[PDB]
Design an enzyme around this catalytic site. Structure first.
Site, short mmCIF file in Angstrom:
data_model
loop_
_atom_site.label_atom_id
_atom_site.label_comp_id
_atom_site.label_asym_id
_atom_site.label_seq_id
_atom_site.Cartn_x
_atom_site.Cartn_y
_atom_site.Cartn_z
N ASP A 107 -3.06 -1.59 9.39
CA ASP A 107 -3.31 -2.28 8.06
C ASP A 107 -3.11 -3.94 8.21
OD1 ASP A 107 -4.75 -2.63 5.61
OD2 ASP A 107 -2.47 -2.15 4.71
N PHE B 168 13.68 -11.44 5.29
CA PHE B 168 12.78 -12.25 4.30
C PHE B 168 12.02 -13.60 5.22
CE2 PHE B 168 11.30 -13.62 0.23
CZ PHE B 168 11.20 -15.09 0.31
N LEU B 169 11.01 -13.80 4.89
CA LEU B 169 10.19 -14.82 5.37
C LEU B 169 9.47 -15.50 3.94
CD1 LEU B 169 10.17 -13.03 7.87
CD2 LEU B 169 8.55 -15.02 8.76
N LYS C 234 -3.70 -7.78 7.72
CA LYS C 234 -4.33 -8.71 6.81
C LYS C 234 -3.33 -9.88 6.59
CE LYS C 234 -2.64 -5.43 3.13
NZ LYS C 234 -3.33 -4.34 2.17
N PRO C 235 -3.99 -10.87 5.98
CA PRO C 235 -3.29 -12.15 5.94
C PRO C 235 -1.78 -11.83 5.18
CG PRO C 235 -5.62 -12.56 5.89
CD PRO C 235 -5.41 -11.09 6.00
N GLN C 236 -1.89 -10.88 3.98
CA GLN C 236 -0.65 -10.57 3.25
C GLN C 236 0.19 -9.99 3.99
OE1 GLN C 236 -3.67 -8.92 0.52
NE2 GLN C 236 -2.64 -9.61 -1.16
N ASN C 237 -0.19 -9.32 4.93
CA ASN C 237 1.00 -8.57 6.00
C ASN C 237 1.33 -9.64 7.26
OD1 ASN C 237 0.66 -6.54 4.26
ND2 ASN C 237 -0.63 -5.41 5.75
N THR D 48 0.79 -1.22 0.13
CA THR D 48 0.01 0.06 -0.14
C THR D 48 0.96 1.22 0.05
OG1 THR D 48 -0.27 -0.17 2.35
CG2 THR D 48 -1.85 -1.09 0.97
N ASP E 118 5.03 -5.20 7.26
CA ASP E 118 4.46 -4.02 6.80
C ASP E 118 3.33 -3.00 7.38
OD1 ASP E 118 4.47 -2.36 4.06
OD2 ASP E 118 2.35 -3.23 3.76
N1 LIG Z 1 9.90 -9.44 4.73
C1 LIG Z 1 8.92 -9.75 3.79
N2 LIG Z 1 9.13 -11.12 3.34
C2 LIG Z 1 8.16 -11.60 2.43
N3 LIG Z 1 8.29 -12.58 2.09
C3 LIG Z 1 7.07 -13.38 1.22
C4 LIG Z 1 7.32 -14.76 0.97
C5 LIG Z 1 6.37 -15.58 0.11
C6 LIG Z 1 5.31 -14.89 -0.12
S1 LIG Z 1 3.76 -15.71 -0.69
N4 LIG Z 1 2.54 -14.75 -1.25
O1 LIG Z 1 4.52 -16.45 -2.21
O2 LIG Z 1 3.60 -16.78 0.06
C7 LIG Z 1 4.77 -13.59 0.31
C8 LIG Z 1 5.95 -12.65 0.75
S2 LIG Z 1 7.12 -10.11 2.27
C9 LIG Z 1 7.74 -9.23 3.40
C10 LIG Z 1 7.36 -7.76 3.90
O3 LIG Z 1 8.22 -7.11 4.70
C11 LIG Z 1 6.02 -7.17 3.09
C12 LIG Z 1 5.00 -7.95 3.16
C13 LIG Z 1 3.47 -7.33 2.88
C14 LIG Z 1 3.70 -5.98 2.17
C15 LIG Z 1 5.02 -5.32 1.97
N5 LIG Z 1 5.04 -4.11 1.35
O4 LIG Z 1 6.15 -3.33 1.17
O5 LIG Z 1 3.96 -3.78 0.89
C16 LIG Z 1 6.08 -5.98 2.52
#
Ligand SMILES: Nc1nc(Nc2ccc(S(N)(=O)=O)cc2)sc1C(=O)c1cccc([N+](=O)[O-])c1
Length: 294
Positions: A123, A78-79, A125-128, A14, A141
């Site tokens: 904010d 990173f995760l 949400k599952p994506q965060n 976002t 995030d």
């Molecule tokens: N550190 C980190 N690692 C991540 N690894 C990741 C690994 C796999 C997937 S997935 N969707 O393939 O399971 C997603 C994220 S995401 C992530 C974030 O700090 C992040 C998360 C959501 C939105 C934003 N942002 O800047 O807007 C950043």
């Protein structure tokens, strides 16, 4: 990035885009967020400094902040997967209750921590929410609206999810409280349990009315001051509250009890993260490891 080799784009936030990247020098793999612009705030660049010194096992570590070329880069640990993907992957079988409980317990610890340091996510949400092979889940995030406020969308014409937004925000409240994060987490908790979003609104009003149709249209009795809120309309339809047992079946009573407290309309009655951690629902909490397909 000259210092970083973009492995791949992993998300559209976002505020900017997120890439999986490797440090050309150190070789460590990280998540790089690119931010849009002709100056950059100050109250924000300092709100960011606070986030860097925010270290907790359930909060994604913000490694570096680099401001250059009218771009703002945020370097995060990173995760490998986010909760949205894990829930989808677990859609046929559902996430096992002990894992759901462990994840909720950990996120509440994360929130209790940021909230005691007067930091709000804003904010959730599952994506965060990011998970690893060790069974940990971490908040990522952070909103940072106290300065960078809340952009019309994300950064470039994109549908911002309203599904987890607290009712007071939808009603025009100007000052958010830690209670907004508890509401969002409650919504996510219900979603892990039922395998279906609790309040999937497609517009702000639809979001609000979906909440009303389920929890009942709020009034002065359950939410003192609600009728005096910026966007409240006396013309709002008057829906009765639905039996809570129809909401998240087949969740047990301890679970439903905790959820109902996380979903109280009145921000001041809504349970805190610290108190939630003490709820009888967590009496038998453990730390299972998830089956992750990376
Ligand atoms: N550190 C980190 N690692 C991540 N690894 C990741 C690994 C796999 C997937 S997935 N969707 O393939 O399971 C997603 C994220 S995401 C992530 C974030 O700090 C992040 C998360 C959501 C939105 C934003 N942002 O800047 O807007 C950043």
């Amino acid at each position: 990035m000259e210092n970083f080799q973009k492995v791949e784009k992993i998300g559209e936030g976002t505020y900017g885009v997120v890439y999986k990247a490797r440090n050309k020098l150190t070789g460590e793999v990280v998540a790089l967020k690119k931010i849009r612009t002709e100056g950059v705030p100050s109250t924000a660049i300092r709100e960011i400094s606070l986030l860097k010194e925010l270290n907790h096992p359930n909060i994604v570590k913000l490694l570096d902040v680099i401001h250059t070329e009218n771009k703002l880069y945020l370097v995060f640990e990173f995760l490998h997967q986010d909760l949205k993907k894990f829930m989808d992957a677990s859609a046929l079988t559902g996430i096992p209750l002990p894992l759901i409980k462990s994840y909720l317990f950990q996120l509440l610890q994360g929130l209790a921590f940021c909230h005691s340091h007067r930091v709000l996510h804003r904010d959730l949400k599952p994506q965060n929410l990011l998970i690893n092979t060790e069974g940990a889940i971490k908040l990522a995030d952070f909103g940072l609206a106290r300065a960078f406020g809340v952009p019309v969308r994300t950064y470039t014409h994109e549908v911002v999810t309203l599904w987890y937004r607290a009712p007071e925000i939808l009603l025009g409240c100007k000052y958010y409280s830690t209670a907004v994060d508890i509401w969002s987490l409650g919504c996510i908790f219900a979603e892990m349990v039922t395998r279906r979003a609790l309040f999937p609104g497609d517009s702000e009003i639809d979001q609000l009315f979906r909440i009303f149709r389920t929890l009942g249209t709020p009034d002065e009795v359950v939410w003192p001051g609600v009728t005096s809120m910026p966007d409240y309309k006396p013309s709002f339809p008057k829906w009765a509250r639905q039996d809570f047992s129809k909401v998240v079946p087949p969740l047990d009573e301890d679970g439903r009890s905790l959820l109902s407290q996380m979903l109280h309309y009145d921000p001041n009655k809504r349970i805190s993260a610290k108190a939630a951690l003490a709820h009888p629902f967590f009496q038998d909490v453990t730390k299972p490891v998830p089956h992750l397909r990376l």
